């Protein structure tokens, strides 16, 4: 048109002159077709960009910037935005003080990433990532939301970008946002970038140390299901890196409650996270117990029935909670008080698979430490059932999902604890187990030799038993294990030989 002829002189203006020309071009970009005439003037497209890059008058920038945003709407519009090198300039503008500039710069960059092929690479190259991470302390939540989204777009399926974000202190910034704001769309775009980073090994620890678990935990009762969902699954993925944090009170309490959810996948998830977060951290165990975690976990087990994606994690947490902390005995008792003993013992049967059976035998072991559990467990038929799992396991080793060594250790270990009670001892040798426990002493696995010597040790406190054990020729292997490298093995062998010859 005759509008291309006007754009011509518009390209010039190289002085104080410029400052006005920008305002003029910017205003003409507002039209629907006056946005087209400027599309096929790459001289102008490239001038609009040069000016903004270089110009050190504030309003001049917002007029060039604004211009490009108008053009970033059409499929041919971004194309020339890219081809004219505007991207690196846009990204340069992310350092500006003027918020009117920043808003244009980020919205335009967004558009480009979503649609213009080559943007992603280009933005990374300009150092957009490190820019965008540093803007995460701006205060406009709409802006934060778009900024975090850009990051998500650049991070996605791109580990290099993930590592770069980690390096720029991205995790702490993202986590601060999760701690501070409540605006749904922002928490959503932020929970997404987080999720995407949480699949990076290096970012896990970093997210965690920055208070990522606690911050996610703050939004688990949010009404926005898409948000709760991102938090739960991100929490779960992080849970294994998170066992040493403090300040986990609120999160643990909420997880217990989530066990009551009607949503199955929320329940499985909550179990998993609880299972991990109860690993080894004694404070976490006490809190979970204090908010009524045993009762919830039992209940959850009953409800789940045969659903092993639920019972395995929940049984594991129960097991963590029934040993190695100040309230472990209280927890052992609670399982009995809340009718847990029959479901627990029942899980030793089909259709349970080995991993669940492993966890369950582990749980029963701890359960047996509580004297008040010796008789009730016996009544449920724990002993004959453990002995069967043991014998089976040992036969398989004599010639998956789990190794039968664990089941053999596990089972023997459980019986070792059940042998503390005198009537249990009678039921135990009762099943002709004493030869099996002696031949176990010869196992290559030291763990197995230990639990075997352990159960023999308890049994031997009774005279008949001790003669029985003596009759099996236990004295030979015991005397040898007396020099095992393994402390426990040697400690029990001494223990057993001691009791073998008392009189």
């Amino acid at each position: 048109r005759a509008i291309p002829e006007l754009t011509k002189l518009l390209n010039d203006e190289d002085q104080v002159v410029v400052n006005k020309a920008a305002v003029m071009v910017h205003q003409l970009s507002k039209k629907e077709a006056s946005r087209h005439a400027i599309m096929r003037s790459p001289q102008m497209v490239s001038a609009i960009v040069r000016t903004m890059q270089n110009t050190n008058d504030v309003e001049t920038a917002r007029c060039t910037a604004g211009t490009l945003h108008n053009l970033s709407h059409h499929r041919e519009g971004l194309l020339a935005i890219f081809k004219s090198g505007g991207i690196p300039a846009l990204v340069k503008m992310l350092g500006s003080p003027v918020d009117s500039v920043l808003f244009y710069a980020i919205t335009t960059l967004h558009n480009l990433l979503l649609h213009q092929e080559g943007a992603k690479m280009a933005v990374r190259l300009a150092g957009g990532l490190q820019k965008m991470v540093a803007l995460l302390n701006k205060t406009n939540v709409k802006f934060l939301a778009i900024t975090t989204d850009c990051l998500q777009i650049l991070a996605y399926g791109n580990q290099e970008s993930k590592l770069i974000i980690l390096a720029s202190g991205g995790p702490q910034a993202l986590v601060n946002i999760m701690r501070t704001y409540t605006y749904e769309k922002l928490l959503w775009t932020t929970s997404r970038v987080l999720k995407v980073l949480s699949v990076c090994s290096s970012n896990k620890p970093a997210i965690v140390e920055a208070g990522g678990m606690q911050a996610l935990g703050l939004h688990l009762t949010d009404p926005s299901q898409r948000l709760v969902q991102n938090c739960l699954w991100t929490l779960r993925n992080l849970s294994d890196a998170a066992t040493k944090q403090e300040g986990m009170e609120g999160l643990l309490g909420t997880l217990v409650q989530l066990l009551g959810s009607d949503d199955i996948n929320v329940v499985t998830c909550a179990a998993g996270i609880l299972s991990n977060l109860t690993c080894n951290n004694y404070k976490n165990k006490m809190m979970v117990c204090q908010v009524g975690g045993i009762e919830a976990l039992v209940r959850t087990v009953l409800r789940a029935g045969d659903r092993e994606d639920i019972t395995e994690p929940a049984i594991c947490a129960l097991r963590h909670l029934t040993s190695r902390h100040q309230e472990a005995e209280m927890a052992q008792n609670a399982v009995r008080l809340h009718y847990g003993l029959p479901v627990v013992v029942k899980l030793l049967h089909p259709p349970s698979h080995w991993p669940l059976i492993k966890a369950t035998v582990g749980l029963i072991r701890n359960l047996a430490l509580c004297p008040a559990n010796h008789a009730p467990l016996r009544e449920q038929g724990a002993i004959p059932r453990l002995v069967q799992l043991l014998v089976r396991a040992h036969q398989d080793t004599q010639r998956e999902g789990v190794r039968m060594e664990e089941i053999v250790e596990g089972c023997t270990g459980a019986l070792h604890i059940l042998a503390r009670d005198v009537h249990n001892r009678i039921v135990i040798r009762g099943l002709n187990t004493i030869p099996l426990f002696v031949q176990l002493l010869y196992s290559p696995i030291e763990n197995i030799q230990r639990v075997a010597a352990g159960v023999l040790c308890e049994l031997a406190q009774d005279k008949e038993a001790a003669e029985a054990i003596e009759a099996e020729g236990a004295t030979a292997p015991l005397t040898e294990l007396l020099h095992s490298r393994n402390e426990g093995v040697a400690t029990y062998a001494a223990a057993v030989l001691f009791r073998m010859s008392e009189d």
């Binding site: 980020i106 294994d240 996948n265 080894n280």
Partner: protein, 47 residues
Amino acid sequence: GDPELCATDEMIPFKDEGDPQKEKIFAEISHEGDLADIKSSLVNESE
């Protein structure tokens, strides 16, 4: 007493595994077209 006071609890190493439908909320959810709206708002502010 528990003789094995040193035994560790075993982490389960969760990731993105299994059926991708068991790692979403079972319930149906349907509350771009999302950020499009808030981008609009920011463009207004700058004037």
